[PDB]
């Protein structure tokens, strides 16, 4: 499953935001990936999120795959809105 | 602990090389990471590894931390060399 979002967070996807993301994704039996410009990283590691250097205004795709993918994806979109990261 | 290497694979770190690295790193409990020109990704993440686009001649550093990080490292140097990826 996949969803595209626009980052609206002011400092882009920095330390706190990569963490709330890893945290939520970590709760699911599903492989969770983050994509920006053709580059994809596993979402369950802050290392590789920090590395993409995603700033405000960017568009990114979140994909999930596995037993719990619908729930995994719905949760991530809830954190993106609720943590004022994107929409 | 860490180890730096020089990539000598003509195609850099492409799908095959990334695959051998990841399979090797995955047998260990230590957290295992790859860094290239300031960007760091989890070595147990095929996606993140490919995202880096490491070409022939670059230098990369492999880091391993935890329980069996000396064996994780020797093991990765060995793959580095027997799989013709670098030295």
């Amino acid at each position: 499953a996949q969803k595209t979002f626009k980052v609206t967070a002011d400092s882009g996807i920095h330390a706190r935001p990569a963490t709330v993301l890893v945290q939520t994704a970590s709760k699911y039996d599903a492989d969770v990936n983050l994509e920006y410009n053709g580059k994809t990283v596993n979402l369950k590691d802050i290392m590789g999120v920090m590395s993409l250097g995603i700033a405000k205004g960017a568009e990114i795709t979140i994909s999930a795959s596995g037993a719990d993918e619908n729930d995994a994806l719905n949760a991530l979109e809830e954190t993106m809105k609720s943590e004022g990261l994107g929409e």
Side-chain angles (χ1 to χ4, degrees), chain A:
Chain A
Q2 55 82 50
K3 226 221 141 255
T4 302
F5 302 89
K6 206 216 234 319
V7 169
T8 57
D10 279 319
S11 303
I13 288 161
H14 52 93
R16 198 219 141 222
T19 301
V20 309
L21 297 153
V22 162
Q23 300 301 274
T24 297
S26 307
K27 292 173 179 167
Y28 302 89
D29 177 31
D31 195 30
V32 195
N33 290 119
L34 191 162
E35 172 207 322
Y36 178 38
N37 303 351
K39 280 169 155 205
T40 307
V41 292
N42 194 271
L43 194 42
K44 291 178 190 214
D45 188 68
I46 55 116
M47 277 354 128
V49 194
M50 306 273 348
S51 109
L52 288 181
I54 298 162
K56 189 169 179 176
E59 272 181 72
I60 61 158
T61 295
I62 291 173
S63 63
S65 72
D68 241 358
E69 72 179 62
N70 296 317
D71 276 78
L73 191 70
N74 280 135
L76 284 163
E77 149 171 49
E78 285 303 312
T79 293
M80 286 293 295
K81 341 227 201 237
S82 250
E83 316 302 318
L85 307 176
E87 81 208 332

